[PDB]
Amino acid sequence: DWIFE
Amino acid sequence: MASPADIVKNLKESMAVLEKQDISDKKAEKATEEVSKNLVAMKEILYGTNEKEPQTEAVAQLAQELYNSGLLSTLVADLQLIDFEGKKDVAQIFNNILRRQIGTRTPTVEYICTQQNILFMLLKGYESPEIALNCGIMLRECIRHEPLAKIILWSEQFYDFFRYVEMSTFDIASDAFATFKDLLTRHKLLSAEFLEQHYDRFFSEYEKLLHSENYVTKRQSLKLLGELLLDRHNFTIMTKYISKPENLKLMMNLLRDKSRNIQFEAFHVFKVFVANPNKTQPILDILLKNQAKLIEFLSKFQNDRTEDEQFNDEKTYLVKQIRDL
Amino acid sequence: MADPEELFTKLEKIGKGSFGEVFKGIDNRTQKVVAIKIIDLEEAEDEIEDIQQEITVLSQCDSPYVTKYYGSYLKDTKLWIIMEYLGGGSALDLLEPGPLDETQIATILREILKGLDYLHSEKKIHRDIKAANVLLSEHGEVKLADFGVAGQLTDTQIKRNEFVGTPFWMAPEVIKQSAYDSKADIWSLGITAIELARGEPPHSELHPMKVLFLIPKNNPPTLEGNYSKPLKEFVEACLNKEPSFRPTAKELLKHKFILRNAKKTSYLTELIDRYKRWKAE
Numbered sequence A: 001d002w003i004f005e
Numbered sequence B: 001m002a003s004p005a006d007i008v009k010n011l012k013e014s015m016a017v018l019e020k021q022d023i024s025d026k027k028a029e030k031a032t033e034e035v036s037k038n039l040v041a042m043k044e045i046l047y048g049t050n051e052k053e054p055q056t057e058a059v060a061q062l063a064q065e066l067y068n069s070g071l072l073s074t075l076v077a078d079l080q081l082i083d084f085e086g087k088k089d090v091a092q093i094f095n096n097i098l099r100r101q102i103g104t105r106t107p108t109v110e111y112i113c114t115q116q117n118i119l120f121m122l123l124k125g126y127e128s129p130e131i132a133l134n135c136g137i138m139l140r141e142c143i144r145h146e147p148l149a150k151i152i153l154w155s156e157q158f159y160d161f162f163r164y165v166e167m168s169t170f171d172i173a174s175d176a177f178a179t180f181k182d183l184l185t186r187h188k189l190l191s192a193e194f195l196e197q198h199y200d201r202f203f204s205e206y207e208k209l210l211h212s213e214n215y216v217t218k219r220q221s222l223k224l225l226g227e228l229l230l231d232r233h234n235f236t237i238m239t240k241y242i243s244k245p246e247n248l249k250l251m252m253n254l255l256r257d258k259s260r261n262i263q264f265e266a267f268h269v270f271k272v273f274v275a276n277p278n279k280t281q282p283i284l285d286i287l288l289k290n291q292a293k294l295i296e297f298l299s300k301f302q303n304d305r306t307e308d309e310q311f312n313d314e315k316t317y318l319v320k321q322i323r324d325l
Numbered sequence C: 001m002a003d004p005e006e007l008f009t010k011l012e013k014i015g016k017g018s019f020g021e022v023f024k025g026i027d028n029r030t031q032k033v034v035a036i037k038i039i040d041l042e043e044a045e046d047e048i049e050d051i052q053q054e055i056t057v058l059s060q061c062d063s064p065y066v067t068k069y070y071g072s073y074l075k076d077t078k079l080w081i082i083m084e085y086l087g088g089g090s091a092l093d094l095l096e097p098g099p100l101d102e103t104q105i106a107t108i109l110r111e112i113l114k115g116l117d118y119l120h121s122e123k124k125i126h127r128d129i130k131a132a133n134v135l136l137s138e139h140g141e142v143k144l145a146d147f148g149v150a151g152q153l154t155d156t157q158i159k160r161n162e163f164v165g166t167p168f169w170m171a172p173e174v175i176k177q178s179a180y181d182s183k184a185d186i187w188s189l190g191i192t193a194i195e196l197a198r199g200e201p202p203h204s205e206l207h208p209m210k211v212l213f214l215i216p217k218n219n220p221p222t223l224e225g226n227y228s229k230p231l232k233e234f235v236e237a238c239l240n241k242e243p244s245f246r247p248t249a250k251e252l253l254k255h256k257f258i259l260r261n262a263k264k265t266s267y268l269t270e271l272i273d274r275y276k277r278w279k280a281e
């Protein structure tokens, strides 16, 4: 999954 | 017989019966039959079976007596008490005369401008199931004309739409959304202005839609957003939108959503954060940080959509950009 | 909100076509038998508001010649169109054991022309007229269904410029994507009459892509066989390559053929037994 953050 | 505006006097009188207390025998039922016949009588003044509508003794005497009698309000204010085919006919009448031009003037738009409460009664109609869909038809015709569009849009009562597109009843909630889409997209300049000025509280409210439990609400709201940002008239609204990291982060999560149709719509919003020449500081911070995981994402994203040209060109445009910082 | 699966109990899959599937079912809250149509909005992608238009059109009608609409519910991605249940099956179902006499044919076409009249008078087109879409009730009442692809005609945008219907039943102008109105529905009725007679339409054996070149170039089709001249020149009223020269739904009700024999309904309850036996055979 995305880098948030 | 065939009268000209004794029809207006009849309607007005019968509606008066239908709105008083009890009498639920003989007279209640005989008043309901009278409203039916006259809405028909009236409906065929304007359309007129196998004989043209008389651009004189028809429309004007009828249009004139509709304004002077305030019958147009009484029918919207009491739309409830009328019967099924009745409400269908009322709405068709209302639409016909609101379209009526004499010269370059639309007399009804002028009348409503001074009887503004008619628009507010229609809008408020969404909260009464028996009439919600009729009021939608009529309201949406009003909206066709900018003065009235303006009246509703700039009113505080427009933010009631964020409840209406969210009802319980799917038919009604969907219709609410139709009107609410019509407002924000038809009179481009009008709505570009509204969005520029009300930005903060509008989009704070629009964001709740993008998180809906209702699938249709979410998918359609998201689809619309993309239309609004990508519009030419809304340049300024767009720039502000694509400067906020919270916005990018939402889109990117919507790229990875349970629904592939919602991911698809998220794409057309996400699309413009990247195509944007003048990016801001935490924009790049998230893109470059999530570079490559994105270039990998984009390639393996909705490839089964080859009946679609642009989409596949935009994907190859986006990976080109996320590999070019 | 409002969970259908709680306040409706779905029973036997009653059909399954284009959009989704239909189920028999019960309204737990009232104990009415309803038909339930369920469309997966996620798979669908006709459009989406274009989908919701089958509800809009259907929900505005209030006729005994059109399937009543009761409501719609949303459950995750599946949309439940709840509508009035009809037992006796399609006209096409009923034609399956074997042919039908000119009384049956006429009374059916009578019942359909009522409805075709309800629709057109308030400026609505069905556009998908065929024996398949004409459902019957257990009482043998005849009602219009699907649409599906029913258009609305406003006071502006009178004619229509779209691309719908099923290929054998389409009216020359619809295939050519020219301008058309309710007269297209009258064409399709013509071919429905032939279907009710010869059990199948003009060029049943041909390929879809053929008959889309055929229908516009060629002459109108005719009732060929042992069938009374009242109808041969009835269908010829409808099947006329020129729209405006096609009758209205109103006068076709006056036409000689309907009136021999315009026997009342319920006298078709034969056909449904006739079909109920043929099926279990």
Ligand SMILES: Nc1ncnc2c1ncn2[C@@H]1O[C@H](COP(=O)(O)OP(=O)(O)O)[C@@H](O)[C@H]1O
Residues within 6 Å of the ligand: C014, C015, C016, C017, C018, C019, C020, C022, C035, C067, C083, C084, C085, C086, C087, C089, C090, C132, C133, C135, C145, C146, C147, C148
């Ligand atoms: N109200 C109903 N009562 C009984 N059967 C129905 C009803 N609605 C649909 N059906 C069944 O479903 C079949 C196809 O439905 P239709 O509305 O044409 O769906 P589609 O557009 O997917 O073809 C009909 O031929 C009929 O057999």
Ligand SMILES: [Mn+2]
Residues within 6 Å of the ligand: C017, C132, C133, C145, C146
């Ligand atoms: Mn069908």
